[PDB]
Amino acid sequence: MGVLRIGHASLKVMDMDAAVRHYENVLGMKTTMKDKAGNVYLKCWDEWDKYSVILTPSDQAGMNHLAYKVEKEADLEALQQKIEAWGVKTTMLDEGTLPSTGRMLQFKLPSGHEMRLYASKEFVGTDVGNINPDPWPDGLKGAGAHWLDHCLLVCEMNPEAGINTVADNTRFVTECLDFFLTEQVLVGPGGSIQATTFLARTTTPHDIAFVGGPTSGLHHIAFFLDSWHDVLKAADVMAKNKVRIDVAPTRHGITRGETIYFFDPSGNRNETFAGLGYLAQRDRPVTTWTEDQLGSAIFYHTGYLEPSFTDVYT
Amino acid sequence: MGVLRIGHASLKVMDMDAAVRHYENVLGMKTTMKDKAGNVYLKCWDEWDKYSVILTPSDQAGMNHLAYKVEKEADLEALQQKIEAWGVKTTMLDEGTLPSTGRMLQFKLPSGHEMRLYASKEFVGTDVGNINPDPWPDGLKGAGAHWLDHCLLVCEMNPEAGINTVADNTRFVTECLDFFLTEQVLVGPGGSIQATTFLARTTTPHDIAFVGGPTSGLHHIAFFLDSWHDVLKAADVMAKNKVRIDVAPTRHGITRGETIYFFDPSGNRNETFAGLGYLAQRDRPVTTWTEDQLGSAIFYHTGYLEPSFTDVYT
Amino acid sequence: MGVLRIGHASLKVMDMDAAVRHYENVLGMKTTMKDKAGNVYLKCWDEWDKYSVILTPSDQAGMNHLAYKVEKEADLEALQQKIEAWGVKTTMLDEGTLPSTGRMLQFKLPSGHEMRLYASKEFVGTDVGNINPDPWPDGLKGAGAHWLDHCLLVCEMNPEAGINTVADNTRFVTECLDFFLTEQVLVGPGGSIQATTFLARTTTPHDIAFVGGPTSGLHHIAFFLDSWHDVLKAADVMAKNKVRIDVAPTRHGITRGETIYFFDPSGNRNETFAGLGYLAQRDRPVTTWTEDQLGSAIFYHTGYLEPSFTDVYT
Amino acid sequence: MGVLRIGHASLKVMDMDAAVRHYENVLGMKTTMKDKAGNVYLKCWDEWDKYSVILTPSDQAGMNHLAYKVEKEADLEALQQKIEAWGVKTTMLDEGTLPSTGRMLQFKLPSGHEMRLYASKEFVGTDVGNINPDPWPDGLKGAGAHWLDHCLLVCEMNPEAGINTVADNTRFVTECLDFFLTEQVLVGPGGSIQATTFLARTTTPHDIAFVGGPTSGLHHIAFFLDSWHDVLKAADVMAKNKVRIDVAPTRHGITRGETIYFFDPSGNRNETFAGLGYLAQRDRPVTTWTEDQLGSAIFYHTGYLEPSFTDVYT
């Protein structure tokens, strides 16, 4: 029972044509529908559900909500009960609130982000099929992202005022949603303050992550690539499409995953993440990164925490 | 609750010095202990428990038993109860039956293989540590296998006599151990016979697998590599060590994982498996491979099922 | 002055539609013209001359001739003079003998193969251009071969009758065409017999190569890929196109280049060759491979000389 | 006849212990001798001559001279004659001027750099040998650089005063040393000014290169790696050794080679260069990069010419 994986992310964009162009041509996603309000829904080739990205017209960037898929419909009642015993109030949006989407349990994380849980979303299949499938499909576009992998949320954090919603979110998704902590960044005196946490339901290093900030927001959504080579191809694609790069190809110290940071035309940050890294396990020790090695935890090859990683988000 | 991953495999070898030489120099494992009976225990660099491979002196090759680790000690009683309601009789070997190993629930699969479940094994840590760790350790040897990944068991199968322990094992580990089926090979009239199944507890394509055969036995144990490049390095290592190759570097149609098959000095087959392949999920459709494409399911690049894959095992 | 590189290879095929389909879809070549006799001319994306492959209608497989490009027109007279002082008779086919091709110096190697040298061939450019070019072009097809890299010729060899045209060809292209020997396979008593030689004009390990055989013929023509990863992609392409594989992805001991052997629909062997391997240099020692390690020289990962490598050619 | 490749580079360092530590541990070179004046000589594993790097004690960074190897001793007289007809005065340092080094023709490039040509240097062999060699050697250290690949020299350039030693060096090495131009960066009105040129004697994209600057100096020396994957490993090595990175892993638009820029402990810039890129050929069109795309020519993935690439050198 419980949460399976990240289901979709709903983003604000200011130019729909340019944004759809970006997620199709750069990341290789496909548009699957547009609702009557102008929202556009896209999926990756190696996902089987209708969509993992919602683009909504807006006058600003940022995130509307984040959705995770659960195994069965009955999980929603059980998780709703645990969430409310913890002190978080929930609502249940019914079927068709979002097109091709079943009912959704809705609530706010302690950091203030809206999170939804759904059990049912329209099946459409991967672009390779499930009867004698090819390992990859022809006509793949751009970086050819496999699937939406995880989301890093900036969480309001003010330790000298007793506010650390990174810690509160971490406690919340572990106790209520039964995520387990895989890696953490410890700052403050003797590493007494959790400033960044990575948590999983799958056996990958992270399906959700939180990083401290002056306010709450969206750091990035991430898409999976197979290998370091695909990261090279993806970087070649971003050059051909005049994409604005945040961080050039390098490796994360945390998770060991090779990565590129870049921006969509509205300013939301995207990541192409390469490799499993390691098999996340509930009996595995939590990987701890300390403040003196804070740079290598994010950008391992340089040990230099970019000013853009910690200052720029939507 | 429940099974986490494959825990260890206990193999028969006829030359201990040569076998230990093989798993250390070719796969990069490290010997962690030798018990009073001459059994040798080895682990991979990216595992944190004491051992994943047991080598036992013998006059033949083959497998003694297969062990999977569960999340907590109380899972053993719960799983024991389910297993026995299904019709399989169990025993509980207590702590220290194997050195550095907690109590073990022991039973036979329908195919006749001995399977054990344990919750407790001595922690020793990975060779990179868990405080500001490097992505890989210096002094890595041979192919530098990350961890024991899965095991493919040959299962007695005689359809015209009503015997298919591949199907019986598949039903057993799903109903009792709550594995889920990720991929299957269908043969016989219209694909009405399961001849090969791949099943998971992690979100990787397989942690156990069964393939039909005239008798039951061990097809191979497999070790994880990161990338296709590491497969090249591993093949270079096998050449330097005069390893007997079964199948040269290629890709599996099933799981999409890139692979090499080769033999230890006693004849047991090993595999170096590269890549995640895809994120296995309980809501993902089961990938079905048919008999006409049976060759591409195992050796995707040639479409040629090696006579050694289906005739040679221990 | 002198020879620059391999220029084109003219092959016999029995099904033109199927053969053109193969070189376009599998190797990623493009048809550039068809002459009035039905011959088809193809080039690779990273070549700038009109064509590197000629397909000619026939009732059998094999090679018509092999062509190398020289730096300037005046080289043809100088090389003609050296060739004839050596004892080989030459002719000069004038402009337009082949479409879009300048005059050609024609002669037979000691092994009997027809070889041509040309200075002039119509320029058409690479598919990426030469003003701010991309590293690779969009719409790349199949394996996306960069260029025709080299050709291995089977050369009549009967040592107990005093016939070794591998040695005679090797002496010929070194003394007359100023190739230099990079690697050799030595067989017979104490390695006293040259059975395979690799020779270069570029600073790559080989632009031409000779291997002994009961008769003279074509072993394969080869196309360059960048990386080991591209070899994986190429093998994936061959599976999608139901290509007949000779040797699955592995590494050559000679040259260190990673490779795949496979067949066109008429039976001619092709190779996708990955990597520089090393910088070939006139002051570099000749790499010598001995008969006991003859298997590793060709298929390094297995040490097993395929019966098809030494029995099957056209 | 003529120049074969870059032979060695002699660098100034301020801390010999730290510098030798860097070239051994980070790049994987080996110290082969130290002369009576404290100069240290190192080679790469895939070079066969005694050394390719000289470290000389100094109170500053920078380059002493640059040396290229020629095919035969008689080339030195012929090249000396051409060089002096051009207007450059030469001297001939005799055998043993440098240890294990034959006589050297010495002269200044128009940009003022000292250049030497030698025909003879002590042979010691590669670390894999030349009889049935492995593709790579065991005990490889750090990034495992194959060989010193090329050198980029900053050349005094003041167009509004009629000074462009990039153009003068380019004309010099082409007319006198018979290099050929492979790629150029064109700036100024309509691209009328050569600001960067890449020139070859091998069939690789460059063995020497010049870039304009306010003064003349050393931009970097470069070492060859096989693949994009080795660039990842090299970046992992630099992190483990706390190396100061200039540019994180990315691809060059020019040459198509994947690259990392970083510094030795004295401030000299090094590069780990991956891949052939393309086969450089005397009949290949010169790749032209324009000023509007000047950023992509150096750092292709971002299109952002680092301020450090054009401001920092020794």
Ligand SMILES: Oc1cccc(F)c1O
């Ligand atoms: O995906 C990530 C893995 C490790 C560290 C990060 F900041 C990431 O975004």
Ligand SMILES: Oc1cccc(F)c1O
């Ligand atoms: O690990 C494997 C994945 C797919 C097919 C197989 F036969 C395997 O051993």
Ligand SMILES: Oc1cccc(F)c1O
């Ligand atoms: O391209 C080749 C390199 C080494 C050995 C061979 F047989 C080849 O075809």
Ligand SMILES: Oc1cccc(F)c1O
């Ligand atoms: O090695 C190089 C290739 C292309 C451009 C550069 F700046 C280089 O250093």
Ligand SMILES: [Ca+2]
């Ligand atoms: Ca994940």
Ligand SMILES: [Ca+2]
């Ligand atoms: Ca697994």
Ligand SMILES: [Ca+2]
């Ligand atoms: Ca070549």
Ligand SMILES: [Ca+2]
């Ligand atoms: Ca070069």
Ligand SMILES: [Fe+3]
């Ligand atoms: Fe991320």
Ligand SMILES: [Fe+3]
């Ligand atoms: Fe396997």
Ligand SMILES: [Fe+3]
């Ligand atoms: Fe070849």
Ligand SMILES: [Fe+3]
């Ligand atoms: Fe460079």
